[PDB]
Amino acid sequence: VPDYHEDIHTYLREMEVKCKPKVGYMKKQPDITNSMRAILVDWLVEVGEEYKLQNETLHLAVNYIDRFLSSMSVLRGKLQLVGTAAMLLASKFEEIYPPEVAEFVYITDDTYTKKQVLRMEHLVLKVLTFDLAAPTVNQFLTQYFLHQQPANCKVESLAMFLGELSLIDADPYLKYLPSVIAGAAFHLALYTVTGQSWPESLIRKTGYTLESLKPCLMDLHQTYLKAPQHAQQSIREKYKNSKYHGVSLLNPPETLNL
């Protein structure tokens, strides 16, 4: 809807910064770890395929978690509750048909009650001061796709895959803003399937050159290289289906030429 491409993009670029969570946030959280975070996000991924939600809801949910765990020290028993409650929130925000709450109790395998989920819902809401309309790695990729010469579901798919991979890894990717992570991905995903690269009309639109991307780009590449060997695979299995053109089986480049 080119009438407001830029006008939206710009707004968004400015919103991330606002809805950006605190980098080493896990370092002050006394009873959880970047490690357990992943077990957490990795699961949500899995929840997302079962209940047939949107990629958006993942990215939204992850981010509510990150933001929230940026302010409330939560204990082990409860990380899962926080994460269920945010899934629910991203649901209510973004799906036409949000899963219901009992369905969300069910996927935690009756850990918490109904009340509890709903009670956290609120806290998350209060703590987030109702600011749930976040930009996501998804949002930007979606937009960047439009500058695709020409479009190619594989590249689109891989782009996603990658992008999503970063949800799991609190370090570094908590370092990067979604617009970059999405920059880091789309390129990576291009060069791989078509050996092209960050198209110049996105240098112009986002003002991010190859160079500026590099530090995201390097990390993103590792993370891609080592994806068959990471502790959490739920994403990887996901981008095995035809839905996503089998991209997780594509074999990444072995050197980024950067």
Partner: peptide
């Protein structure tokens, strides 16, 4: 059809 699960010590 199998994603329910209890992630940690509660």
């Amino acid at each position: 059809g199998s994603a329910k699960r209890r992630l940690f010590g509660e």
